Amino acid sequence: MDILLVCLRFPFFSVAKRSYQVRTSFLLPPPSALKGALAKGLILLKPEKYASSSLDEAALKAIKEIESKLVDIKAVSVAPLSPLIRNAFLLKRLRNLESGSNAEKSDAMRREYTFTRELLVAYIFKNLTQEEKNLYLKAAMLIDVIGDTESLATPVWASFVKPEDKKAPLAFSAPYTEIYSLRMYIEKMRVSPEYSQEEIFYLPIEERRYKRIVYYARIYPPEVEKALTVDGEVLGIWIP
């Protein structure tokens, strides 16, 4: 029973919903992007068998393997320790994917990014063997980008720390299943990547307007049976 925990320090992340013109950025990074990150890491480290002729097929099979290793499909969780704010940028973003209008068209479009000092993400695994545990620890880092390419991400620390069955208020994100069982946020973040499913997610951020933008901070949901300790601070977490 092991859980990877890696903290990423990034300027922005621009992963967004299904939307036109504006790509409505997620309030917190989705499980699908988090799974794809270590899928890319593992296919980069060992292309001996995880890399196939089709890049899409190789990524999809890596995702299948990593989700088979996950205790549940809704496993990865994030910690919004730093404040979450949103800003809007006008980007050239030529929209030539439309059927027609040649290729010399320039539609000035507009997008928004999410600013946050840093985040922590958890990868819960079951009884992974050391011969692959070292490889997965190596793949924990090398997560250079999350979502949009311009949204660089830098993992500074990554480690394997056991929950030890501590008691603390919930801090990590969790699906909206036990929170209903016991300022409440409801979202949908596309659990698995879509390739040629969606479940109600509780979002652990609340509003505190001290400045112009209200941004978000800890809502401190109730106490949970499982918790994780990092640098002297204990944070709640739920697993199936």
Binding positions for RNA, rule: CB under 7 A: 14-16, 18, 23, 30, 32-34, 36-37, 39-40, 43-44, 55-56, 58-59, 90-97, 106, 108, 110, 143-150, 190, 193-196
Shortest distance in whole angstroms from residue 4 CB to RNA: 15
Q: Which is nearer to RNA, 142 or 217 (CB)?
A: 142
Closer CB to RNA, 30 or 236, in the complex:
30
Beta carbon of residue 150, minimum distance to RNA (angstroms, whole number): 7
Of the pair 10, 168, the CB lying nearest RNA is at 10
Q: Please, which residue, 55 or 200, has the CB nearer to RNA?
A: 55
Q: Least distance to RNA from the beta carbon of 223, Å?
A: 31
How many angstroms separate the CA atoms of 161 and 233, rounded?
13
Burial 107-141 (b: 16+ CB within 10 A, else e): eeeebebbbbebbbbbbbbeebeeeeeebbbebbe
Looking up tokens 């199936």, which residue turns up?
240
Contact indicator for 194, 136 with CB cutoff of 8 Å: no
- Within its chain, how far is the Cα of 41 from the centroid? 15
The residue type found at 51 is A
